[PDB]
Design an enzyme around this catalytic site. Structure first.
Site, short mmCIF file in Angstrom:
data_model
loop_
_atom_site.label_atom_id
_atom_site.label_comp_id
_atom_site.label_asym_id
_atom_site.label_seq_id
_atom_site.Cartn_x
_atom_site.Cartn_y
_atom_site.Cartn_z
N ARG B 23 0.80 -1.23 0.00
CA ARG B 23 0.00 0.00 0.00
C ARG B 23 0.85 1.31 0.00
NH1 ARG B 23 -0.91 0.18 4.57
NH2 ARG B 23 -0.83 2.29 5.39
N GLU B 60 -0.26 3.50 26.35
CA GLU B 60 -1.08 3.10 25.23
C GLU B 60 -1.94 1.88 25.55
OE1 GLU B 60 0.10 0.30 22.74
OE2 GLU B 60 -0.34 1.35 20.82
N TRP B 82 0.52 7.70 18.48
CA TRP B 82 -0.70 7.86 17.66
C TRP B 82 -0.90 9.27 17.13
CZ3 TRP B 82 -4.34 4.24 16.03
CH2 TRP B 82 -4.18 2.95 16.55
N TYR B 144 -8.52 0.87 18.91
CA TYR B 144 -8.81 -0.32 19.76
C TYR B 144 -9.63 -0.07 21.01
CZ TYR B 144 -5.32 -2.21 16.52
OH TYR B 144 -4.66 -2.59 15.37
N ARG B 177 -14.42 -20.04 23.39
CA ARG B 177 -15.12 -18.86 22.79
C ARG B 177 -14.53 -17.49 23.26
NH1 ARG B 177 -19.68 -22.87 21.24
NH2 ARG B 177 -21.15 -22.43 22.88
N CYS B 196 -4.73 -3.86 12.45
CA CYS B 196 -3.73 -4.92 12.30
C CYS B 196 -3.89 -6.03 13.26
CB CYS B 196 -2.32 -4.37 12.44
SG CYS B 196 -1.93 -3.17 11.12
N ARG B 216 -2.94 -9.30 11.18
CA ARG B 216 -3.08 -9.51 9.75
C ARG B 216 -1.82 -9.11 9.00
NH1 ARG B 216 -3.41 -5.72 7.27
NH2 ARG B 216 -3.89 -3.51 7.65
N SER B 217 -0.98 -8.30 9.62
CA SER B 217 0.01 -7.47 8.89
C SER B 217 1.09 -7.01 9.92
CB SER B 217 -0.64 -6.21 8.41
OG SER B 217 0.31 -5.38 7.78
N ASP B 219 4.77 -4.92 10.41
CA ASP B 219 6.05 -4.32 10.17
C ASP B 219 6.96 -4.94 11.21
OD1 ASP B 219 8.42 -2.84 10.05
OD2 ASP B 219 7.40 -0.87 10.01
N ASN B 227 4.35 -4.48 19.47
CA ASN B 227 3.20 -5.40 19.41
C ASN B 227 3.28 -6.61 20.32
OD1 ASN B 227 2.37 -4.83 15.88
ND2 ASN B 227 2.33 -3.45 17.69
N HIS B 257 6.21 -8.68 7.19
CA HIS B 257 7.12 -8.07 6.22
C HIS B 257 8.22 -7.21 6.86
CE1 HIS B 257 3.52 -5.73 6.99
NE2 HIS B 257 4.26 -4.64 6.84
N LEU B 258 9.38 -7.22 6.22
CA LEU B 258 10.44 -6.25 6.46
C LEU B 258 10.35 -5.24 5.33
CD1 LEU B 258 12.04 -6.84 8.88
CD2 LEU B 258 13.11 -8.71 7.52
N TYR B 259 10.13 -3.97 5.66
CA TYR B 259 10.31 -2.96 4.65
C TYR B 259 11.72 -2.97 4.09
CZ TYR B 259 5.71 -1.26 5.52
OH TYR B 259 4.35 -1.14 5.63
C1 C16 Z 1 5.41 -0.03 17.29
C2 C16 Z 1 3.94 0.30 17.38
C3 C16 Z 1 2.92 -0.50 17.91
C4 C16 Z 1 1.56 -0.09 17.92
C5 C16 Z 1 1.12 1.14 17.40
C6 C16 Z 1 2.10 1.96 16.86
C7 C16 Z 1 3.54 1.58 16.83
C8 C16 Z 1 4.25 2.70 16.19
O1 C16 Z 1 5.53 2.67 16.01
N1 C16 Z 1 3.37 3.67 15.85
C9 C16 Z 1 3.78 4.81 15.25
C10 C16 Z 1 4.57 5.76 15.94
C11 C16 Z 1 5.04 6.94 15.38
C12 C16 Z 1 4.73 7.20 14.05
C13 C16 Z 1 5.19 8.28 13.51
N2 C16 Z 1 5.63 9.28 13.33
C14 C16 Z 1 3.98 6.29 13.30
C15 C16 Z 1 3.52 5.12 13.90
C16 C16 Z 1 2.09 3.30 16.23
O2 C16 Z 1 0.97 3.92 16.09
O1 UMP Z 2 0.67 -1.98 15.34
C1 UMP Z 2 1.01 -1.93 14.15
C2 UMP Z 2 0.32 -1.11 13.22
C3 UMP Z 2 0.75 -1.09 11.87
N1 UMP Z 2 1.82 -1.86 11.47
C4 UMP Z 2 2.25 -1.80 10.07
C5 UMP Z 2 2.15 -3.12 9.31
C6 UMP Z 2 2.21 -2.59 7.89
O2 UMP Z 2 3.53 -2.62 7.40
C7 UMP Z 2 1.79 -1.13 7.97
C8 UMP Z 2 0.64 -0.80 7.02
O3 UMP Z 2 -0.60 -1.42 7.34
P1 UMP Z 2 -1.42 -2.31 6.26
O4 UMP Z 2 -0.85 -2.10 4.88
O5 UMP Z 2 -1.27 -3.78 6.58
O6 UMP Z 2 -2.88 -1.93 6.33
O7 UMP Z 2 1.47 -0.88 9.33
C9 UMP Z 2 2.49 -2.65 12.41
O8 UMP Z 2 3.43 -3.34 12.12
N2 UMP Z 2 2.08 -2.69 13.71
O1 UMP Z 3 -16.35 -27.24 11.86
C1 UMP Z 3 -16.29 -27.57 13.06
C2 UMP Z 3 -17.30 -27.23 13.98
C3 UMP Z 3 -17.17 -27.64 15.32
N1 UMP Z 3 -16.06 -28.33 15.73
C4 UMP Z 3 -15.96 -28.75 17.14
C5 UMP Z 3 -14.78 -28.16 17.90
C6 UMP Z 3 -15.26 -28.41 19.32
O2 UMP Z 3 -14.74 -29.62 19.82
C7 UMP Z 3 -16.77 -28.56 19.23
C8 UMP Z 3 -17.51 -27.62 20.18
O3 UMP Z 3 -17.40 -26.24 19.85
P1 UMP Z 3 -16.88 -25.14 20.93
O4 UMP Z 3 -16.88 -25.74 22.31
O5 UMP Z 3 -15.46 -24.73 20.62
O6 UMP Z 3 -17.78 -23.92 20.85
O7 UMP Z 3 -17.11 -28.37 17.87
C9 UMP Z 3 -15.08 -28.66 14.81
O8 UMP Z 3 -14.08 -29.27 15.10
N2 UMP Z 3 -15.18 -28.28 13.50
#
Ligand code: C16
Ligand code: UMP
Ligand code: UMP
Ligand code: C16
Lengths: 312, 312
Positions: B23, B60, B82, B144, B177, B196, B216-217, B219, B227, B257-259
């Site tokens: 992105r 935080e 932030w 969050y 759950r 993320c 999901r993602s 850095d 994190n 990923h590593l930038y």
């Molecule tokens: C390492 C970490 C973890 C969770 C959330 C955040 C960061 C982080 O570096 N930042 C961050 C901090 C500073 C800047 C800038 N400038 C951009 C991003 C976060 O918002």
């Molecule tokens: O707590 C955080 C928040 C953001 N990112 C980084 C991961 C990605 O490199 C970057 C951009 O976000 P996405 O492209 O995955 O949306 O932000 C982190 O590593 N940790």
């Molecule tokens: O696709 C499925 C649906 C259910 N379960 C099983 C996992 C648990 O042993 C059980 C009960 O569900 P929970 O206790 O985790 O809610 O259902 C599976 O393995 N696969």
């Protein structure tokens, strides 16, 4: 072999899983946080060491891709996987007339089987034919078809979550936002099954498309054989509808448990020598997977060992 | 050592990660599906090979536990993590009067730093003091604190997602759950950062409490050091508020990923010999963690190597 991370994951829960009580008051042997991966280009991972009916996998996945939540579609594909949950809103129903306080009583008393089966086939039947009944006792509501394709939005509108992310893969193949989620915080406190397959996300790099599942909870003997297949199937389909080649399926677990019922069954499976893995042929002239039918997916060369019978 | 799965995960992305555009139109070297685990009973995993200010982590995290989404709380704890995202709704604002089309221009032109800093401290200041401005340019909305503690429900009501699951751990320590999710399908298509840290779930067996993150993602150089700490911190706190001992933190990645900016910085870190890991002392007479203040969490014996400077 392709399925060895399953056998490994079944072994490791035997060898070092710790005892754990569960919602079910059966025991389990259980672990938290596991990851197996499957290189989908080396074949398809329908386990060979135990028979997993692909037909059942595909109908049910096509049910999900259709945004359908009605036991009916399933039922005309001879697929009974989801049957009990529909029967339940039937046996409770204020207009029910036939005694099923029923799953805890399967094996428990043989003479139940007779009148369970009887009252269950008497109900399957009437979902198949009688529309009012079906609209009412056959529609399971909030199961994967709605979460994926009609997620109930706060403006009362409905989101096509999965469709949207496929467009997004077509369009931005590289984003790390390619998430479909089935976990609705608004619904999990009061909902029959909070979904086990809580999330997945797609990933594209240099031609191939991969998918990772977060499964909160996994019955390793019953649930996981099917689960791996359904989600490797999903990956192929989307790879297909997007023209990408397939790469990996990654299966991530929270609580991965062997029920204590399932101890003998697993060891037995573990003596079985896995066989070369089948290949999957998707029909090469259709692409809109929201439009797939059974014949659009075929499994070359599945050669399984026999099914092993199991106390759910 | 406790932090070695990080160093391992940084190494593996070097040695076998494949190139990937993002992105950001920086490059990355990237992998899908990774899992590191940290045995929280052997010490706390603030990386020692690179300085990660715990103070910033805790303020935080206490921001999140409070259900707060306003840059203000953070700002009175000397925490600027932030800051930029709040500044942005300021520089766009229809009543803004001061040129910041700004993050792409940090290092890009030194003479920006002067008037970026100037216009950024001029804004931080006025969040601190002027309430109308703060209510308006300092509140980040859907980050969050709202997802966890005030998740916007469809009836317009608001769910205490995290509180609820802590009760649920108190009450049903064994369910699989025990999920808190930060992924709102209704919001991710149009929202500044789709989160993320998309999910986590708690897990209890025989005394200990563990937590797994689906990220999901990631850095790997900037994001992951923080994190890991924030989420190991979360685990301790809940272990604490529930009287359980701590067990594992499991960190699960989609796209890790590593930038390409960060290539030299990482190698350097990789020459650093990690040091014995600090211990975490939570205040042993307070338990309602929704009520923690900075002094309720202390880090014995963090002995880090110096910070390594890094192009975000
Ligand atoms: C390492 C970490 C973890 C969770 C959330 C955040 C960061 C982080 O570096 N930042 C961050 C901090 C500073 C800047 C800038 N400038 C951009 C991003 C976060 O918002
Ligand atoms: O707590 C955080 C928040 C953001 N990112 C980084 C991961 C990605 O490199 C970057 C951009 O976000 P996405 O492209 O995955 O949306 O932000 C982190 O590593 N940790
Ligand atoms: O696709 C499925 C649906 C259910 N379960 C099983 C996992 C648990 O042993 C059980 C009960 O569900 P929970 O206790 O985790 O809610 O259902 C599976 O393995 N696969
Ligand atoms: C293996 C798998 C995967 C996904 C979904 C399901 C199953 C499964 O065995 N069942 C299932 C099937 C039959 C019964 C019964 N009786 C109970 C549960 C599923 O609903």
């Amino acid at each position: 072999m392709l399925e060895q991370p399953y056998l490994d994951l079944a072994k490791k829960v035997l060898d070092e899983g710790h005892f754990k009580p569960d919602r079910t008051h059966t025991g389990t042997y259980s672990i938290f946080g596991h990851q197996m991966r499957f290189d989908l280009s080396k074949g398809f991972p329908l386990l060979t060491t135990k028979k997993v009916p692909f037909g059942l996998i595909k109908s049910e996945l096509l049910w999900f891709l259709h945004g359908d939540t009605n036991i009916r579609f399933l039922l005309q594909h001879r697929n009974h996987i989801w049957d009990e949950w529909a029967f339940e809103k039937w046996v409770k129903s204020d207009e029910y007339h036939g005694d099923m306080t029923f799953g805890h009583r399967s094996q428990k008393d043989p003479e139940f089987a007779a009148v369970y089966h009887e009252e269950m086939a008497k109900f399957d039947d009437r979902v198949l034919h009688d529309d009012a009944f079906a609209a009412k006792y056959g529609d399971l509501g909030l199961v994967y078809g709605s979460q994926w394709r009609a997620w109930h939005t706060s403006k009362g509108d409905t989101i096509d979550q999965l469709g949207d992310v496929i467009e997004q893969i077509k369009t931005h193949p590289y984003s790390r936002r390619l998430i479909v989620s089935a976990w609705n915080p608004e619904d999990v406190p009061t909902m029959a099954l909070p979904p086990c397959h809580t999330l997945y996300q797609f990933y594209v790099n240099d031609g191939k498309l991969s998918l990772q599942l977060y499964q909160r909870s996994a019955d390793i003997f019953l649930g996981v054989p099917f689960n791996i297949a359904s989600y490797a199937l999903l990956t192929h389909l989307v790879a297909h509808e997007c023209g990408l080649e397939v790469g990996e399926f990654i299966h991530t677990f929270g609580d991965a448990h062997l029920y204590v019922n399932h101890l003998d069954q697993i060891k037995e499976q573990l003596s079985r020598t896995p066989r070369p893995a089948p290949t999957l042929q998707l029909n090469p002239d259709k692409h809109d997977i929201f439009d797939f039918d059974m014949k659009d997916i075929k499994l070359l060369n599945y050669d399984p060992y026999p099914a092993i019978k199991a106390p759910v």
